[PDB]
Structure formats: C-alpha cells, structure tokens
Amino acid sequence: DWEGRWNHVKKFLERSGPFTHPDFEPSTESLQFLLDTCKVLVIGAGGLGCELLKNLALSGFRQIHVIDMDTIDVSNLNRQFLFRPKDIGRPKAEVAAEFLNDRVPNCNVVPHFNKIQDFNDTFYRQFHIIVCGLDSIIARRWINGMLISLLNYEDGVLDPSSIVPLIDGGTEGFKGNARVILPGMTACIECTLELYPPQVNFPMATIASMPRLPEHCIEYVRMLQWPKEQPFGEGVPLDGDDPEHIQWIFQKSLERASQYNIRGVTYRLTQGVVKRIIPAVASTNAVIAAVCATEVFKIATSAYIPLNNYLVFNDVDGLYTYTFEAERKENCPACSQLPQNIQFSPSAKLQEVLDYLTNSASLQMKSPAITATNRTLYLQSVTSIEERTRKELGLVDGQEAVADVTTPQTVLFKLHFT
C-alpha cells in the first residue's frame, strides 16, 4: 500500500526465471491478486502459528484465517511472540490476529476461537491453501481427512480444482519437519503415518508394583492415586495446569519416590510427566514455520516448484536437513481412491476386525466403529455401544462387504474397507 513496500516479493512475481514453475506467468498484476483473492487458513496459533502468520503476512497475503482452541498461557511467552503477559488468559486465536492485523498495515486476519473439528467441509472449501502447526497427531490426521473429502471424483478422474494444498509443520525440541500435501496425488498424513516415533507407554504393572524411575512415581500419583482418593473433591478431574494440583501430585510423587527410594523427583518433572510436555524454543519453530511459509507462497504464486512432500531438521549437532519425496501408499486407509479391499479372514470372526483397525500400525485408529449393510455393529462413541458391547453370528452375516468405519476424530471421513 506504500512506496517500495512489496519489493521483496515483486521480484519473484514480476520477473520470469530459470527454476520458475511451468504454469508461471510473469505479471505486474500477480501481486495485487494474491493480496486480494488468495484465502489462506492457518491451523494453530502458538509457536508455529505465530511464526506462520508473520511469514504469510509479509509474503504478500492479506486474507488469512487463524483457528485455535487454546487460550494464552504464560508458558507460551517464550516463543509465541504475538502474545504478551497482559494478554494471558485471552483467546490465542484472537490476540494472534489482533496483534498481526496491527503490526502489518493492511493485513486482514480473521480469528476463530474454535477447534478445527468444529467446522465441516462447507467451511474449509473456502480456502486455497491450509498450513498446520498443530501439537497433536489426531488433529493432523483429522484435518487430513477433511481436506480429502473435498476431493471431487469425475468417474475415477480427480478434478484438479478440488484439491486443497495442505502444508504441515512439526516441531519437538531441536528437531522439526515440514511437508507438502496435495490430497489425491501426493502422500497424505495417513500415508506416512508410521514416520512418527513410538509413544513411550509405561506398563501399569511396573507403575504400581515395581517403580524404578522418578517418572514411574509421578505417573502413578497421576494415573492411579488421584482417581482413587479424589484429591480436590469427588468427580473433580486433574487439571494439569492448576499449580495446586501439580503441587499435590508432586508432593505425593515425592512421597512415593521415597517409599521405593527413587531419587530424582523435581516439580518441573512432575509437570513433564503430568502434562506430557514437549521441550521447545523459538529457534526451531522459526525454521520449520519459515519453510512451510515459503512453500505456501510457492504454491500460491507458482514462482517455484513446491517442495517434494518432506523435510527433516536438526539443530543438536550442527545444522542438518534431509529433504525427500515420501511415497504415497497405494493402499492409504485415507487417500485411497477406492475402498480398502482387504479381508482379514474367512471363518475367523469379527473381534478380528476391531483389533486389526485398532492395532495395525497402519491404521492405529482409536475407539473405531463399524457399520454394515445399515446396521450398527457397535461404536464405543456411549449407550449406543452398550447395546452391542457384544460373535460369529454376523461374523458370517457380512457375506463376502464394505463394512464401514469411522474413528473418534481419527478422521473426519467415513473409512470404507472391504
């Protein structure tokens, strides 16, 4: 909107180039267009979110929406620059936009104090690109679905203008990863689902019978001792963020540690164990976010070739970044054009279809639900399951198909496996 402002962008849109993407047209109009027409949703507003918003804003984007279910907490102020202590307690999404729409002259950021799973296709169809900066997997998986259901198939053929580019960002300490997705072409989130490490899960046995680490003590005072002697009144849940709660858990983990004389219980650790905290700092987020950012700008302007669906980053030993093109599993429970033609047995029943979906390291669904042809074969989602928490009867009734699943937020879609 003023002299010389967007020079650091015009040069990539106004000028032609060697590595320029094919569909690239060098125009003086290109910019204004981006600024007026390009709608971009930014999921999450903390660490990545903040950084993302900044990057996008100064890259030439005006129409930006930010979604985010959380409310600012002091412990964010060490890397989520868009928040100040006075802002504590406020809606992250709100403040985020508030600040950004101010620092950057004519930006038009729209906040959404919601959790992505609040909207339905209708909503997401709006945007051209979507960038993630979520701190859970489910969420990623979920939005991954939603973005596929938008795909429109013209008799086996995918309509190009029904694909919404989904760029994802990941952080965790000094390590990070960024990827580009084109649901229905490039590998989805569900495709490279096993690239995620194994969540360290303590066998309850040791937690109650044979503790060894300070962690095992805390995890006890949390996973069991609290639910037992209702610490702060009956029914009351364990609010990980409520000091007095941690202080108690700390105190009790401190006493437990003493019983089996395991040293090493610090308040800070009691929080770690309880909140399942992930160490983080600005440094990293900056990097990853700055990458996804560029990609979006690439995708949106086509001024360069979009990254090939992957990049891993690591600061611990010097700087390192492997960049590869993950393969799209031709049987992705999610991005599979057709159903999941996969029979897991002939004679062997249907208790063998839940445990498959729930454990198979390729689906990992959480408390799923199977539908058939339209009768409900129990869904743990509360009284509609009890009427079926109950078999070779229908273990044959299914014939020999298109049993149909849908996991609690695992995916927004309805999974169809045969």
């Binding site: 660490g47 900066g133 960002g169 965790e172 990863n177 690239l195 490490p197 983080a280 390192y320 393969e327």
Partner: protein, 76 residues
C-alpha cells in the same frame, strides 16, 4: 555388500549387509554402531520407507547406496 545409513544428524555410518538380510536386521546393525533403538528408526531409501520385514534386496539396495534415518514430529 557395504551400505551407508546416514543417521538423523547426517553422521553416516557404514554397514555390512548381504542382499538377503531383512530390513529389520539392517536396523540392528545401526543400533549396534549407534545405540539407536530399532524401535524408533525409520529408514528411507529413495522415497520408499524400508519395511523391517522385507530384505535389502527387496528394495534394490546395492553397493554404496545411502539409506536415511528420518522422523516425523508431534509438537508445534
């Protein structure tokens, strides 16, 4: 056969593997030299991500071919 499996910090360790060793073993070889639990290793040879049930040959791994340890992250 002598392959190199670049760690997640680009260290790049060298390994002795015959085109019949299950991928699963390829990992134990890494853990032997680096102490990287096989549980949390995700190998990647030219896009394809090694399945610890197949064989080095199954993925066309030959001579001085480079494998990459990789990772996906939760936080944000």
């Amino acid at each position: 056969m002598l392959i190199k499996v670049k760690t997640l910090t680009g260290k790049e360790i060298e390994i002795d593997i015959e085109p019949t060793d299950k991928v699963e073993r390829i990992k134990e070889r890494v853990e032997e030299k680096e102490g990287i639990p096989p549980q949390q290793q995700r190998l990647i040879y030219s896009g394809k991500q090694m399945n610890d049930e197949k064989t080095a040959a199954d993925y066309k791994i030959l001579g001085g071919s480079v494998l990459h340890l990789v990772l996906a992250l939760r936080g944000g």
